[PDB]
Design a protein around this ligand. Structure first.
Ligand code: PLG
Ligand code: PLG
Lengths: 953, 954
């Protein structure tokens, strides 16, 4: 039926053929291994017939890769790049081009995920330790984590930490915090049942000994630098904690929160060399007094020792986190902002304390200069002491000032009260100051104003304490040196530039160059999140197009982009459910059913959304236990708010009767939350919204190619049925309401569409793949997983399978029996894989002592076979131990991983060869050998001796 | 100003570019026993040549503003759809190759693969390039690139002369005009006559024709059978040379199949941007019988010390650095990085993907042709690949008016006809615009329906390609984006580069290639402009040229700069040719003698030979300086016939000559011109200027002194600055005029594009604009400090071979390793390979003095890095002392066994009388977590040349 032109002149390229690893020959061969005639037969045997799409996805014709950037350009060029001096927690900066090119645009940095396998991850672990050290030095607090999502969520994590600490149900918020910070804090509080009160310090009453904590900002949203010593002391005297939202650049010249008693310091690291990104991504910072560390949210790098006593790095105190403690975790956060934390660390390293002081002094002096010019022109400054931010009462019409501002394409903050906020930044030069003085009708140039001329250096607030005294911040100031340091860390880390990283529950698929290109385009990267919307019409088109596509892939009616991780999506989803229930008079329903199979974020998110969790058991086949489910529905039917189902579940299987589960919950007055993170098994085949789900978040960083970034960034947009739409998150600065019916749950992220600048990645993937491609991707994800399962099934037990014996896109290998037979544990297999040139699969989750394997469609048959051959070779190593052919204490498995130092040493007293140690199979060649950089990590020692900043060189 | 007090400059790029800060410099000065930088300079650079007043430059631009500054220029360019053709064709550069290779410092910072054991990645990739060229052209061996199409065609002409010494060369007038101009220029000054003849006009009967050059498809688009022409050539003892197109040859029977001896062209449309002329790797392939006369580098397969199959540069005695004026060419820096881009293109697509692209382009061209015919236009040629020649049925003006409205360029032929060359980028929408331009009142859809699926054009012709290509596994394995990224990273990681450690190559200036400098070269406003557009579409480039010229004139003391020469050697060639044209014009054409000190770089004599000059070597005195007695004697001898001298200053011996003005005066007084090789300007910039002390003309190496990346052996740019008396004779170009006055008397054309590789000039512009006058001076000062610091630290362990008047070197120096041959049976190569174990690429090995090392750190490396290198050399000296004093076996020791591969050091078998730790981690800074492994044992240089294999082995 094709036009003749299409026969003579076919498509230039099909991106699916670049994205999807196995071609026709690979797929036939894998199907032959499975004893199947076709892909359709596989799908038919895997995905329940009754949930499958009736018609193919309705998508636009696929866009050739050689046109995708021009296509996207026609959108991005509709944005306008003004000079934004809005402030409000986002400040333009001069992103060092060397960090941008050698880290952000380097696949050796961005394709790896969370550093669960430390011995092949020491580079990003070191960098994240650098980040923590930097945060602790500058804030003056004892320990910092390895990033939070944004400023607002960090402030909410502070509120919740206070609750966890002293269990008081009142939290005081200074109204001079940024508005979006207040909104996110108020939302978190609302659904956790804590009362917030907006009170100036002088209005705050702690005497009731009923205040969990207080949040204030320094400098505050108006720009003012204030002494909070007395406030903090009053808080402490009544058993309350003190939380300070702050600014790393300001703290380069301001005495920090640590020196005035603050228990928690937090903010955004964005202006340390990361783009505005029209809201993100940015790594937020969070630091606390050592006595609070046990309650820390998120990841934290710690120093430990390896097997030989060498000083090395690992994620510390991991039992705090969602994947261990589930609803009892310190937070729901999983994916964070690792890559951007590392960008900010490299910024601090490149500049040192001396360079950062120089930048900060310059910004402050530019602000002082403008300040004097405006006063001479008859305008009033509301605050005399400030860092980079003025609050101005215009001596003339505000309209006339903004008219001139518009003429020079400059944005200010417009306060409610008719005054203007101006926040200067690293990028502000003489020319900009002259424009600004002209805007305010100051006849005097910047040069002239400077002539007649204090601030922070002349004040009691002058910083007198050192920071970044560690060698790491004093060694890499030449561009040659920073490039070498970045490369050194990169080369310590196994990533998708080396080999398949088959992490179950992570979807480590291709992050394509064409998808990634636009995220550093200025029209995406260099827009302030809070500009007037007529400057971001390109973004608006992007959002509409991606929304429409995601709606079609999922069967939902509306998408909300605000949630900036999967866990945030779950939290937003549940909150929307509760707002829906409240609105319709059913607010008493707070019970959330959660299968024990569901991802750990699910119960943590339900706890964060103030729900009562009822676990639901899973049966022996790996499915939701139908008997228990029916019993828990019956038990809770009066109070039932929701179920959270992961589908297919974390056990790797499709439940045969998921519609029936959805019907049962609906019949008893509850809503269905479906965790969409496993949509890599669904896209183009079935849709959660078709089979009875009400709301689902998606992991754009899993299914839709946003890079794993060493542990972030992510995006967790939620798709909802239209009955939930009126209750979707909005934002106090930029309005997200679609209807007059709107009844927003609140605000879950600091920026209205979260990390907007990385959405182009998923838009590009979707537009290049089209309907046919996206389907093929899912088909091949399922094929690849089942092929691997088939190859391995006689060597390892496949723990769970679907009703006809097939898995989804991932499966579990039950390594548990080897404990009794050979004293071999999952960890031994995981470390030994490193010697075979592979990052382990997901280790000891969701079932202790097992491995969860997810190849993705992006890896080809040869690569799958290398991995299966490694596992089969390892099985034979286990059999050697089982059958007494090798020492059961000293063997490759127990001694893994084998470092370069180990294998090149003059001393060799192992009962196996150096070749068995390091080159166990012929595909592991000296010319492609990736070395674990350290011997086996000591997990216990690190937690018993907690060191979470850079140790002396 | 007080503003600068309150509001200092945001940043100073010099502090990022220059490795040593204040503490490092003071400490190095203390080591030298000197009080200040000025004292060092005063003691080093002769007072009489130094600047009178400081450089007059613009205020330095902060790094955080350089890209906005450059954007104000680049945005003045206009990006049309250019269907001009003429050897440049838009293509779809795979973004993955662009990001993971062109924008990857692990690919682009290294230079020529002189140290094979730490260079197997780019050597493999260049072997891929060669294999690709040989497969597609059907010839036996190909090089690892040339500069451009036109120079490749000229190399072919010269190869023919070298082969049979006949002094007549026949050129088909249907070659591209720029190809013809470069070929005619080469011929003019080599004393070969060229005759422009159609094949039927070509007379070989005299048996006086060296060779013939024709093109397939030709510049008008025609596909022609040249079998008979080639046979006639061969019958009379002549060679046949064919300029061609790698994409066309995906579906056309290739020149190899119709007897051609040499096939050449541009690899540009295999995944490289237009670049407003470059850079692009030219290809050049020959019959096996001609390989000995091959120009440029060529990768060969050999074995390592263990018998493993590995890669090295082969038959190196052909090249300038060995044979000087007797080399097969002057070429040094080529287009390595861009050859590797084109290889990765072919690998990513395979023969099947390339066939797909080629068939699509051809079918688009067939569609367009059928539409134009139906609209009443005449096609001049029925059989073509991608290029039509159209006699408009209506007014050309009316057509071009519509073309302008859709921002589409055609080629405008002299005879009033239009050339249209379609390319990979052409889609339905473009075809529809083109049909509308020609007033067809059809659509591409409609035209397709009228055509049917009758196979027409090349598939339906006797020219259909039937022979396979790219059958090697390398072209059939890496078609997923995941796989190509992994392959590119695998090769990258085999190669030591500036992302690892200092690469102190004498005569290379391995300085910082900064991210900010590099960013713009892949901006579309620089990368995606056809070199031959109307100039009103390239006004940003015009401002770039003006600004860079003005800066270069100020740095050099010259009056005008010409950007056409696309390597240092090409600059030398252009410079000498200009000198000869100047001499010709004033009636002094008899003067052809060029004096060349033996210290001068090997390119100098090769270039003089290429420019038809008689070379008189001049000796060097025991101190390393031009021998005064011999110089005066050679001047006296050649007085009547003296055309030029070529001086490297400071010379390749690493030293400033005390009386260079006197040398210049002597040559001038005897009627000659002074060519000064500016490649060593990193010891001069901001301190002295060649033009201020008697130089008439210099080339610069922008890829040494001015930060263009070394690219694994290219690209470079070799612009020449001249005094105004030489300016009228500067190169022009037949397509885009470079004449300033009616006074112009151009030497000819030396490069295929008027400003050569335009798209990489922004790098040097950016360096200069960020550094300013003060920064550039500091760079030079610190280059000199760093070299002298190293020399001082090493001088009690190694002999420093040459020093200046007061004992100081310039930016580089020579370590005399020769005595260790007698004392320890240790050779320069042993020291070079042993450095690999210490984590360093060797310095320049056995040049310019056999058995020595030449060391150049540059200003970009800091004291800690210099100290690591000196400590390695001191440790190695002690290893030599252990051999000298019989403390270790003289045959089996780390030095003789170097380099130590991963396989070697991890083997179960170890029977060396030294430890694995001494082998691989000889000093504490060489740590397991930073260890760079030589991927192979020591290369066997003899074996490779005795078993010549120059394509991928099975
Ligand atoms: C099934 C599932 N659900 C929820 C999440 C939460 O997404 P965030 O990571 O964006 O908050 C993940 C993340 N998968 C990554 C991992 O488990 O390590 C997941 O696999
Ligand atoms: C002093 C000198 N002169 C001329 C050239 C020739 O420049 P091209 O390579 O651009 O042709 C070089 C190249 N230096 C590199 C080397 O010696 O191998 C050089 O060092």
């Amino acid at each position: 039926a094709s036009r003749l032109l299409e026969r003579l002149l076919p498509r230039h390229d099909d991106f699916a053929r670049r994205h999807i690893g196995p071609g026709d020959k690979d797929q036939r061969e894998m199907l032959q291994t499975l004893g199947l005639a076709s892909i359709d037969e596989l799908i038919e045997k895997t995905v329940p017939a009754n949930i499958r799409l009736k018609r193919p996805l309705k998508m636009e014709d696929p866009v050739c890769e050689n046109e995708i950037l021009a296509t996207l350009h026609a959108i991005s060029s509709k944005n306008q790049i003004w000079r934004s001096y809005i402030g409000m927690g986002y400040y333009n900066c001069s992103v060092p081009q060397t960090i941008l090119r050698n880290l952000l645009e380097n696949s050796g940095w961005i394709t790896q995920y969370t550093p669960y396998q430390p011995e092949v991850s020491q580079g990003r672990l070191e960098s994240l330790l650098n980040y923590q050290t930097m945060v602790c030095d500058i804030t003056g607090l004892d320990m910092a984590n390895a990033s939070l999502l944004d400023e607002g969520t960090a402030a909410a994590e502070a509120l919740q930490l206070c609750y966890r600490h002293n269990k008081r149900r009142k939290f005081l918020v200074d109204p001079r915090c940024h508005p979006q910070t207040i909104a996110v804090v108020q939302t978190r509080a609302k659904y956790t049942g804590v009362l917030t009160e907006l009170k100036l310090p002088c209005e705050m009453d702690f005497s009731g000994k009923d205040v969990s904590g207080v949040l204030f900002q320094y400098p505050d949203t108006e720009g003012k630098v204030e002494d909070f010593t007395e406030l903090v002391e009053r808080a402490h005297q009544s058993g309350s904690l003190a939380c300070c939202a702050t600014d790393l650049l300001a703290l380069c010249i301001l005495r920090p929160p640590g020196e005035f008693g603050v228990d928690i310091a937090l903010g955004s690291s964005q202006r340390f060399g990361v783009p505005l990104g029209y809201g993100g991504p940015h790594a937020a910072f969070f630091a606390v007094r050592e006595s609070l560390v046990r309650m820390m949210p998120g990841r934290m790098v710690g120093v430990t020792r390896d097997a030989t006593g060498k000083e090395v790095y690992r994620l510390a105190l991991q039992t705090r986190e969602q994947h261990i403690r589930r609803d009892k975790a310190t937070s729901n956060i999983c994916t964070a902002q690792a890559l951007l934390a590392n960008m900010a660390a490299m910024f601090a390293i490149y500049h040192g304390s001396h360079g950062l002081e120089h930048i900060a002094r310059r910004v402050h002096n530019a602000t002082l200069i403008l300040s004097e010019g405006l006063k001479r022109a008859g305008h009033q400054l509301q605050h005399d002491l400030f860092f980079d931010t003025l609050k101005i009462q215009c001596g003339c019409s505000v309209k006339e000032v903004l008219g001139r501002a518009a003429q020079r394409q400059i944005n200010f903050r417009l306060f409610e009260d008719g005054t203007l906020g101006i926040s200067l930044d690293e990028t502000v030069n003489e020319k900009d100051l002259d424009d600004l003085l002209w805007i305010f009708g100051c006849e005097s140039s910047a040069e002239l104003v400077a002539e007649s001329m204090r601030g922070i250096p002349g004040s009691v607030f002058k910083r007198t304490s050192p920071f970044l005294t560690h060698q790491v911040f004093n060694s890499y100031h030449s561009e040659t040196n920073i490039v070498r340091y970045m490369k050194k860390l990169e080369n310590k880390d196994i990533s998708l530039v080396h080999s398949m990283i088959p992490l179950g529950s992570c979807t480590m698929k291709l992050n394509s160059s064409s998808e990634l290109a636009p995220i550093t385009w200025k029209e995406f990267a260099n827009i302030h999140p809070f500009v007037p919307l007529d400057q971001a019409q390109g973004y608006q088109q992007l959002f509409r197009e991606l929304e429409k596509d995601l709606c079609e892939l999922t069967g939902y009616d509306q998408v909300c982009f605000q949630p900036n991780s999967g866990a945030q999506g779950e939290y937003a989803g549940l909150a929307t459910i509760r707002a829906y229930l409240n609105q319709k008079g059913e607010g008493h329903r707070t019970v959330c059913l959660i299968p024990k199979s569901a991802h750990g974020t699910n119960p943590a998110s339900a706890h964060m959304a103030g729900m009562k969790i009822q676990p639901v058991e899973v049966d022996k086949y790996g499915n939701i236990d139908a008997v228990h489910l029916k019993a828990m529905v019956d038990k809770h039917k009066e109070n039932l708010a929701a179920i959270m189902i992961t589908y297919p579940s974390t056990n790797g299987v499709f439940e045969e009767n998921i519609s029936d589960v959805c019907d049962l919950i609906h019949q008893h007055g509850g809503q269905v939350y479906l965790d969409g993170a496993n949509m890599n098994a669904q896209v183009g085949i079935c849709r959660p919204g078709d089979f009875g789900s009400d709301v689902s978040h998606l992991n754009l960083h899993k299914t839709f190619c946003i890079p794993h970034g060493g542990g972030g960034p992510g995006m967790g947009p939620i798709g909802v049925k239209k009955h939930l739409a009126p209750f979707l998150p909005n934002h106090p600065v930029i309005s997200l309401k679609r209807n007059e019916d709107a009844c927003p749950v609140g605000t879950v992220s600091a920026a209205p569409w979260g990390s907007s600048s990385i959405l182009p990645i998923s838009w590009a993937y979707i537009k290049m793949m089209g309907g046919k491609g996206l389907k093929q991707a899912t088909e091949t994800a399922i094929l690849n997983a089942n092929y691997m399962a088939k190859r391995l099934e006689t060597h390892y037990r496949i723990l769970f399978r679907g009703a006809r014996g097939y898995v989804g896109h991932e499966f579990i290998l039950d390594t548990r029996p080897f404990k009794k037979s050979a004293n071999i544990e999952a960890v031994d297999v995981a470390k030994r894989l490193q010697d075979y040139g592979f990052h382990a699969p997901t280790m000891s989750w969701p079932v202790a002592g097992t491995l969860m394997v997810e190849p993705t469609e992006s890896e080809d048959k040869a690569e799958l076979d290398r991995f299966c051959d490694a596992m089969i070779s390892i099985r034979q190593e286990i059999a050697d131990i089982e059958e007494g052919r090798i020492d059961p204490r000293v063997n490759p498995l127990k001694m893994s991983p084998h470092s370069l130092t180990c294998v090149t040493s003059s001393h060799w007293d192992r009962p196996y060869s150096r070749e068995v140690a390091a080159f166990p199979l012929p595909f592991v060649k000296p010319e492609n050998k990736f070395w674990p950089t350290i011997a086996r990590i000591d997990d216990i020692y690190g937690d018993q001796h907690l060191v979470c900043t850079c140790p002396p060189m």
